[PDB]
Amino acid sequence: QYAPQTQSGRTSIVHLFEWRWVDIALECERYLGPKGFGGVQVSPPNENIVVTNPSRPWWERYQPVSYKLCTRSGNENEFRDMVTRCNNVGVRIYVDAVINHMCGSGAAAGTGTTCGSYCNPGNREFPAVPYSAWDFNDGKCKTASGGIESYNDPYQVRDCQLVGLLDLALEKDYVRSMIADYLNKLIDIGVAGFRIDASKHMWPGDIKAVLDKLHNLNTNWFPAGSRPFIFQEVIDLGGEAIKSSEYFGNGRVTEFKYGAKLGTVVRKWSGEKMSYLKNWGEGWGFMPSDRALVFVDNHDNQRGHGAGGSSILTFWDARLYKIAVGFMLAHPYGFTRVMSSYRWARNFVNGEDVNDWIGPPNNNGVIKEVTINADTTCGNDWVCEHRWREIRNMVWFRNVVDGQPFANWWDNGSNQVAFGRGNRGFIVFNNDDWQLSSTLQTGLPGGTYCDVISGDKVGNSCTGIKVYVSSDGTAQFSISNSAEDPFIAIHAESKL
């Protein structure tokens, strides 16, 4: 469940948060395929409850009412069309599987749902599944409120309601099977794997029971005997009762310590310095690389009060964000997931964004299409970080150096560091408040390389900075602390 199942050589996936199926299909063909992206994590494709207060927040999609592929992103025909078109150009689709719960227990009964299905939350009725009161954890939960009151008790975290959400009785074969049927339909359609939502709130064994029922991947695009890629979303920053390691037997796990620690370091908070990143990975107390799904930020924490809090770097802090994303994409640790967001009107009161609920760009509830501008950026307030040259080229960098070991590390004892990947790539960073001017061993063959951060290799020339590597592998890197992008990256395919 550990292999990403991306086409050979493609090493990253991108979270196209709240994007509609038709836009993702076009994106695979016009961009993701040609640019070497391994796949796309899509928002929950199953029907959810409509939330009118606030008006259509992004989080209403985490309140399932059925397993019908009918959402604001599109219907079943559009979903299938997207999976087919993306797979046909070598770009995989990974589904955000919301299976720990249904909608809020306080929600009203009716057909105010994304596909018009009926549900009565108060009586635990979800006829479109179908689920009834017998399929929920109400009696199993031992807290007086019926909700999670203490994370120090693994039992209530798994058996009680997460923020009032109706907790599914995952111990039951009926429920496990109902979930497996939904997931298997997705697999047969062409999906390569799943992001298991709120995994921390389910027992590792229950998840395993669901996973054991899954089909092998569709042979139209994958080799026979291929198991779906599984990455479980478990928020574990350490120092708590539930550990990410409890889920290693099911597949990969999201390493939230990654972005929290990296953001703190790049921001230079708590006395942290980039030079400390020499032993990045397990050296920093992280899970094994082969069990990790890493990222700088995700849809939750980019809003400021998730795992990592204010230390999390996002598109709002563009310069430092590109540095953090670049370091991640160059470092061999874990399987990388790049974030792709939309802008919203932030309003911090007492250190917290009260507008963090704002849903995707829309016209009266209808999600806007993703328009592409001549300069390759996006319109309609879709940030499209995955299209920024500095990120796009680092995604390619990761593909180029795939399999090469961490090597030639260098640091100035403060915030200037550098390292390579075997003899195929090298990256240099200056995060200090002064000039970087050093001749370093790159581990690369002599020649002239185009810096893929400031530009690209076009024909027999570079559009940006050029790096002349000596016969002995050394090269001078001069980066001012006032540079827009204080880092340089070169690889085998950027060589003239």
Ligand SMILES: OC[C@H]1O[C@H](O[C@H]2[C@H](O)[C@@H](O)[C@@H](O[C@H]3[C@H](O)[C@@H](O)[C@H](O)O[C@@H]3CO)O[C@@H]2CO)[C@H](O)[C@@H](O)[C@@H]1O
């Ligand atoms: O009515 C039930 C509750 O609904 C709302 O909770 C939101 C959260 O505020 C929001 O962060 C989001 O949480 C999910 C998160 O995005 C995902 O990464 C994690 O793995 O699982 C979470 C649940 O699936 O969605 C929930 C559900 O809508 C509302 O904020 C709360 O007050 C209500 O009690």
Ligand SMILES: OC[C@H]1O[C@H](O[C@H]2[C@H](O)[C@@H](O)[C@@H](O[C@H]3[C@H](O)[C@@H](O)[C@H](O)O[C@@H]3CO)O[C@@H]2CO)[C@H](O)[C@@H](O)[C@@H]1O
């Ligand atoms: O190894 C498990 C721990 O790994 C991580 O610790 C980081 C520190 O956060 C970071 O400050 C740094 O520690 C240096 C320390 O600040 C300095 O006084 C000393 O002289 O050198 C230390 C080594 O560079 O590096 C370590 C990792 O090596 C992680 O943050 C922590 O939670 C884990 O327990």
Ligand SMILES: OC[C@H]1O[C@H](O[C@H]2[C@H](O)[C@@H](O)[C@H](O)O[C@@H]2CO)[C@H](O)[C@@H](O)[C@@H]1O
């Ligand atoms: O590849 C398209 C353009 O991407 C970059 O521009 C980014 C910029 O780096 C980032 O700080 C900002 O937040 O977003 C813009 C794009 O919206 C490159 O710098 C440009 O040269 C590219 O044209």
Ligand SMILES: [Ca+2]
């Ligand atoms: Ca649960």
Ligand SMILES: [Cl-]
């Ligand atoms: Cl996540």
